[PDB]
Amino acid sequence: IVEGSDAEIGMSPWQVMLFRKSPQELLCGASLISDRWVLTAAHCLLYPPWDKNFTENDLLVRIGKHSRTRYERNIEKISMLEKIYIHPRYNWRENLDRDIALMKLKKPVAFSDYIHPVCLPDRETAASLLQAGYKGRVTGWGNLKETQPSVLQVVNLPIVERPVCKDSTRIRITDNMFCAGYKPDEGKRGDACEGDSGGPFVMKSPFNNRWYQMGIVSWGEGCDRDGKYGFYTHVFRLKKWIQKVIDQFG
């Protein structure tokens, strides 16, 4: 996260760290959506241009974390993956369309002060909140600039108008993506960056005061560049797939 701040304790208790077993290192962010399901970006798991293709046994999930590097005794919980599910129309060849994947945990995780799931939006919440100018929050342990934090970083970013999203890049953008960030004239800045991939873009509904995950950190050209924006997987647009998987693999 570029130009963010340290998180408060328990501020994002759905934040998940995707961790590589050997060599031990951060791979990506993710989110907790129930006691056994974690949501992430497909590109975290499968990206053939970079020879990336991880299997269940290559990884672990670390939940309830604050510190990036520290092993957070009596607080974080480490979970093994039972099964990875990637969107069958994930477009790794071109633009990361449908950049989404589910991970099923071997055992249920125990909820605590620091571990708690985020909600996924219904159609009406998405229609009400995904408006240009409305702000969400993105969280992660990735880089602080484009060429590492001690603790989880947080940044609030406004949703950008689709024409501005489109005109900021040569990449083909789809209805399964949205972009967020400040315009050059807006002064303020911030963005996701490398290692923030797969982490949640959340909004707090003013109707029921619950946090909803509207997006997944997906792609960006550079990090926190003027005139560029971060792109997010549109979770509501892929919800039908999410429910099929969960409805199918319990």
């Binding site: 031990q24 290192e25 672990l60 590097t69």
Partner: peptide, 11 residues
Amino acid sequence: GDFEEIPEEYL
């Protein structure tokens, strides 16, 4: 690699 060793049991 600045990552603290995790309990062997999760490996």
